[PDB]
Amino acid sequence: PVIRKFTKKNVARAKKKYTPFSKRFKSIAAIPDLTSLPEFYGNSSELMASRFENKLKTTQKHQIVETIFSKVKKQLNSSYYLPARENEFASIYLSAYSAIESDSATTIYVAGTPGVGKTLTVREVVKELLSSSAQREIPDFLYVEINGLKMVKPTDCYETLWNKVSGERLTWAASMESLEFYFKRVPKNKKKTIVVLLDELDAMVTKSQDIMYNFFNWTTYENAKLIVIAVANTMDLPERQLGNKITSRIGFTRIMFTGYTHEELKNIIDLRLKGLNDSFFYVDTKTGNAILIDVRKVRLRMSADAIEIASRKVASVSGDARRALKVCKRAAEIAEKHYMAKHGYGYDGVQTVHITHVMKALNETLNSHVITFMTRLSFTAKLFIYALLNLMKKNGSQEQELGDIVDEIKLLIEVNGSNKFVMEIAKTLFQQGSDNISEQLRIISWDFVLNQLLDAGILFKQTMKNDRICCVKLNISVEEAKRAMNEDETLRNL
């Protein structure tokens, strides 16, 4: 045969066809009704879940103990009635209902900051629309959800949509022409409205505006019945991508989701804990199992001051809801740990949570752990930091040479040769305590402390093979290093 110049022995290719849709049913007048086909619109395909489920199952439960705080922790996750988001719900629902009722196409753009709750309210709107359609008030439709961060290649959207509307399996380009023909030329008497939910839109338009332009433009055609809802972080993202005139031609609806306040967040937290708060529980003393209404009758309380202070702190900085929920959950977890530790329980009066637990859980996310890290470092590393600070206090250049640091360390050692500690540390620092080792040039354990400081994210060193003129710089500002040095004793004194 032939001699290959290189080989690819780990190539895997999926079985997908190439011929687009506008070659199948011949003339346009020969297209049958697509509503009644058993493969179109997912009419009969409801067995994909059973293909891979029942694999992660096992048969054993050794009477898992459920402490009192377990219920509170379980009922406070980010998965388990919208209290604040009502205007956006009304606007989106009205737009979508008007679009569905009159058999038209439309585009809704939602922009916001993380944790506001845009996906939740969009899904709630979709559920309400599905219920209304099942009530036989508007023509039935299909709901397709497409995410942006859950795809390997960015151009995998097209085929997915096609695979959710036809049952075929084509490549991305052929899917693009198939979708174009389907949305343009198929008559409106043989289709069904589709509600796409393009999500994390900013992750698709990163090399070109092709996907966004196509998806937004497919709503312009008269024969199409598409209703696109796209959510994103930045508000004026399409303008920065497509252009003013194209956007003006398209004419979509725009909605902005502002952050939360310290009242709405507290309302959310209080709503998520209604039945549990101020209730009664039967608790077994031997094990610790708790049952909602020998054994004891106890109560669970959560101080409103703790909720208020947590909401006030969280809403001040970001406006999230996930972080507030997680803070409350962590406070409950700390209280549960203390309770089990005190009562000597294990895995398999009025118990409350005070403001102290919430404050302790809140301080863990704001404080930094650099000062504590340096107040426990070795003597040589602290000497290195001290020499660097001294050189910076003279040159004021923020980027020092390494040989200068070595010379400064040597001068500092040789000029204070009258203090007891540095008098008796010199031999262990230069000859490691033995009389058979010649006097070293740099220090004992130079590279070790250098790499220990450089790995932790405290120093920055440029790459040069000459190890005497390499430049290093700090990365934690200067006041923190000054505090860390001042907390010492032998370095403070000299």
Partner 1 sequence: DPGFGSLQRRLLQQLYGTLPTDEKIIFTYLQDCQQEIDRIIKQSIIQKESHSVILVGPRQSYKTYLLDYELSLLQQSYKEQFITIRLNGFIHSEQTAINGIATQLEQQLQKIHTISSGSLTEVFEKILLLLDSSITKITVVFIFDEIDTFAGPVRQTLLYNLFDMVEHSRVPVCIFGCTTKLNILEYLEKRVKSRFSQRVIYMPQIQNLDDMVDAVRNLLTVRSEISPWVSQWNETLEKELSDPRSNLNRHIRMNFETFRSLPTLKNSIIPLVATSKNFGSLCTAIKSCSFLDIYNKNQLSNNLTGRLQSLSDLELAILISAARVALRAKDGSFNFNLAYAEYEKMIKAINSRINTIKLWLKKDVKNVWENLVQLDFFTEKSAVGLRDNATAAFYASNYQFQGTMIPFDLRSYQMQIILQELRRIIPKSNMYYSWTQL
Partner 2 sequence: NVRMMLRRSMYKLYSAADAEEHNDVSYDLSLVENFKRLFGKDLAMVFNFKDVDSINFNTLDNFIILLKSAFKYDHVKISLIFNINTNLSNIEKNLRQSTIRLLKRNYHKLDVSSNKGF
Partner 3 sequence: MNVTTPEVAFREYQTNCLASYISADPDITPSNLILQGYSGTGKTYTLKKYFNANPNLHAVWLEPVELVSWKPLLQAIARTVQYKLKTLYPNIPTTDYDPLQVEEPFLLVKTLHNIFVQYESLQEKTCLFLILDGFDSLQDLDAALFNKYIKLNELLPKDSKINIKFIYTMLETSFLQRYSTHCIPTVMFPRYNVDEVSTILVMSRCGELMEDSCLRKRIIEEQITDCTDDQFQNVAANFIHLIVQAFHSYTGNDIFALNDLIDFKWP
Ligand X SMILES: Nc1ncnc2c1ncn2[C@@H]1O[C@H](COP(=O)(O)OP(=O)(O)OP(O)(O)=S)[C@@H](O)[C@H]1O
Given ligand X, Mg ion, partner 3, none, residue 7, with its beta carbon under 5 to 8 Å by kind, binds: partner 3
Output 2 or 350, the one with its CB closest to partner 2: 2
Helix (H, G, I), strand (E, B) or coil at 326: helix
Name the token pair of 177: 């022409």
Neighbour tally for 265: CB within 10 Å: 26
Q: Give 211: exposed, middle or buried? Use CB within 10 Å, 0-12, 13-18, 19+.
A: buried
The residue from 28, 90, 120, 456 that contacts ligand X (CB under 6 A) is: 120
Tell me the residue number closest to ligand X, measured at CB. 117
Residues 451-490 that bind partner 3 (CB under 8 A): 451-452, 455, 465, 467
Residue with tokens 């620092």: 429
Q: Is 345 annotated as a binding residue?
A: yes
Output 204 or 387, the one with its CB closest to ligand X: 204
Apex 323 CA angle, 319 and 325, nearest 5: 110
The residue from 113, 119, 171, 287 that contacts Mg ion (CB under 5 A) is: 119
Rounded CA separation 65/287 (Å): 7
Neighbour tally for 119: CB within 10 Å: 16
Output 7 or 60, the one with its CB closest to partner 2: 7
Q: Is 251 annotated as a binding residue?
A: no
Instruction: Based on the shown chain and the rule CB under 6 A, indicate whether residue 329 belongs to the binding site for ligand X.
Output: no
Residue with tokens 């010492």: 488
Given partner 1, partner 3, ligand X, none, residue 152, with its beta carbon under 5 to 8 Å by kind, binds: partner 1
Instruction: Based on the shown chain and the rule CB under 6 A, indicate whether residue 118 belongs to the binding site for ligand X.
Output: yes
Q: Is 122 annotated as a binding residue?
A: no
Question: What string marks each residue from 385 to 424 as x (binds ligand X by CB under 6 A) or -?
Answer: ----------------------------------------
Output 332 or 450, the one with its CB closest to partner 3: 450
Output 200 or 401, the one with its CB closest to ligand X: 200
Rounded CA separation 461/449 (Å): 14
Residues 177-196 that bind partner 3 (CB under 8 A): none
Alpha helices in 376-443 (DSSP H): 379-395, 402-415, 420-430
Residues 244-283 that bind ligand X (CB under 6 A): 268
Contact of 89 with 121, CB cutoff 8 Å? yes
Q: Is 206 annotated as a binding residue?
A: no
Contact of 325 with 78, CB cutoff 8 Å? yes
Contacts of 40 (CB under 8 A, 6+ apart): 34, 165, 166, 167
Q: Are strands 279-284 and 295-302 parallel, antiparallel or unpaired?
A: antiparallel
Closest separation between CB of residue 121 and ligand X, Å?
A: 7
Name the token pair of 448: 């070790």
Neighbour tally for 194: CB within 10 Å: 20
Output 53 or 455, the one with its CB closest to partner 3: 455
Q: Is 305 annotated as a binding residue?
A: no
Closest separation between CB of residue 459 and ligand X, Å?
A: 18
Closest separation between CB of residue 348 and partner 1, Å?
A: 5
Neighbour tally for 467: CB within 10 Å: 10
Binding residues (CB under 8 A) for partner 2: these are 3-5, 7
Closest separation between CB of residue 398 and partner 1, Å?
A: 19
Counting residues that bind ligand X (by CB under 6 A) gives: 15
Name the token pair of 387: 């020499």
Q: Is 414 annotated as a binding residue?
A: no
Chain centre distance of CA 415: 54
Q: Give 99: exposed, middle or buried? Use CB within 10 Å, 0-12, 13-18, 19+.
A: buried
Span interacting with Mg ion, options 79-87, 105-113, 116-124, 447-455, rule CB under 5 A? 116-124
Contact of 229 with 176, CB cutoff 8 Å? no
Question: What string marks each residue from 8 to 27 as x (binds partner 3 by CB under 8 A) or -?
Answer: -xx-----------------
Closest separation between CB of residue 133 and ligand X, Å?
A: 23
Rounded CA separation 259/86 (Å): 14
Closest separation between CB of residue 34 and partner 3, Å?
A: 45
Span interacting with partner 3, options 114-122, 213-221, 415-423, 448-456, rule CB under 8 A? 448-456
Name the token pair of 297: 């009758």
Output 421 or 460, the one with its CB closest to partner 3: 460
Number of residues that make up the chain: 494
Q: What are phi and psi of 203, to 5 degrees?
A: -90, -5
Given partner 2, partner 1, partner 3, none, residue 426, with its beta carbon under 5 to 8 Å by kind, binds: none
| Break sites following residues in the chain (C–N > 2.5 A) | 80, 293, 348
Site residues, ligand X (CB under 6 A): 78, 82-85, 114-120, 268, 321-322
Site residues, partner 3 (CB under 8 A): 7, 9-10, 447-448, 451-452, 455, 465, 467
* Annotated binding-site positions for ATP: 112-120, 200, 233, 322, 344-348
* Annotated binding-site positions for Mg(2+): 199-200
